Amino acid sequence: KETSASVPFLPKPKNLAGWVGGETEFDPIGFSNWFDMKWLREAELKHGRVCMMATVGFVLQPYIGAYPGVEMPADSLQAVYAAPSEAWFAFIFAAGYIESSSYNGKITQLNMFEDSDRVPGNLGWGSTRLEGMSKEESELMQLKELKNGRLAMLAFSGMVHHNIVVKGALFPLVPDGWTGPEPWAVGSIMNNXXXXXXXX
Partner 1 sequence: AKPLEMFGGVDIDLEDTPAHWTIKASPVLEPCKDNKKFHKKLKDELYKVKKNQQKFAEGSAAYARFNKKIKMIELRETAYGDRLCGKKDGLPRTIATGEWNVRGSAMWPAAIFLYIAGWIGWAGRSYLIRTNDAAKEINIDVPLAVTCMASGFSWPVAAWQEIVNGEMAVPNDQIHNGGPWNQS
Partner 2 sequence: GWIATDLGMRLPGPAYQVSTLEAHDAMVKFGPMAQILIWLGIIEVFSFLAITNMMEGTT
Partner 3 sequence: IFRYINTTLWAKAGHFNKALSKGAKTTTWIWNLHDYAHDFDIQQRSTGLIARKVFSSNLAHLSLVFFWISGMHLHGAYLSNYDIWLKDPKSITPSSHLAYSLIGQDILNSYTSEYFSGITITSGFFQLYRSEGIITQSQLKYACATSLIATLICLSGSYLHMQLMSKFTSFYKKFQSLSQDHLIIIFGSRSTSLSAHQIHKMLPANPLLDSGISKPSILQVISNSLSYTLALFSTNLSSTGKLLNPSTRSVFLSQVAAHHKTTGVVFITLGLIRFLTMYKSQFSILTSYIDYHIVLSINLALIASLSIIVADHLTRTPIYPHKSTSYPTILCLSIHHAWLSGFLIIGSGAHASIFNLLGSPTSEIRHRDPIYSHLIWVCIAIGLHSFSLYCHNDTLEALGRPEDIFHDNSIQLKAIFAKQSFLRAELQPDIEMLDKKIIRITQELGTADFIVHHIHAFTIHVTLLILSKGVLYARNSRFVSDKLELGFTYPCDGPGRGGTCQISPWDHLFSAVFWMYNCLNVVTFHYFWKMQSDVWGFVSIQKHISHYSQGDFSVNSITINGWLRNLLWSEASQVIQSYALSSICPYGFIFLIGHFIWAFSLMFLFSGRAYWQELIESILWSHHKLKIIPHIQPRALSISQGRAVGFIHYTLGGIGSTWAFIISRLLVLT
Ligand X SMILES: CC(=O)O[C@H]1CC(C)(C)C(=C=C/C(C)=C/C=C/C(C)=C/C=C/C=C(C)/C=C/C=C(C)/C=C/[C@@]23O[C@]2(C)C[C@@H](O)CC3(C)C)[C@](C)(O)C1
CB of 16 or CB of 45, closer to ligand CLA: 45
According to CB under 8 A, which residues from 91 to 110 bind partner 3? none
Long-range contact set of residues 37-45: C-beta below 8 Å, sequence gap at least 24: 37/120, 38/112, 38/113, 38/117, 38/120, 39/109, 39/112, 39/113, 39/120, 41/120, 41/121, 42/112, 42/120, 42/121, 44/121, 44/146, 44/149, 44/150, 45/120, 45/121, 45/145, 45/146, 45/149
Among 3, 35, 70, 89, binds ligand CLA (CB under 6 A): 70
According to CB under 8 A, which residues from 17 to 36 bind partner 1? 34-35
CA proximity to 114, closest of 123, 124, 104, 122: 104
According to CB under 8 A, which residues from 158 to 197 bind partner 3? 193
Instruction: Return residues touching partner 2 (CB under 8 A).
Output: 1, 3, 7, 9-11, 28-29, 180-182, 184, 190, 194-195
- Partner whose binding site includes residue 68, from partner 2, ligand X, partner 3, none (CB under 5 to 8 Å by kind): none
- Partner whose binding site includes residue 107, from ligand X, partner 1, partner 3, none (CB under 5 to 8 Å by kind): partner 1
- Partner whose binding site includes residue 30, from partner 1, ligand CLA, ligand X, none (CB under 5 to 8 Å by kind): none
Residues 42 and 37: their CA atoms lie apart, in Å, by 8
Task: Determine if 54 is a binding residue for ligand X (CB under 6 A).
Answer: no
Coil, strand or helix: which one is 141?
Answer: helix
The residues of the shown chain that bind partner 1, judged by CB under 8 A, are 34-35, 105, 107-111, 195-198
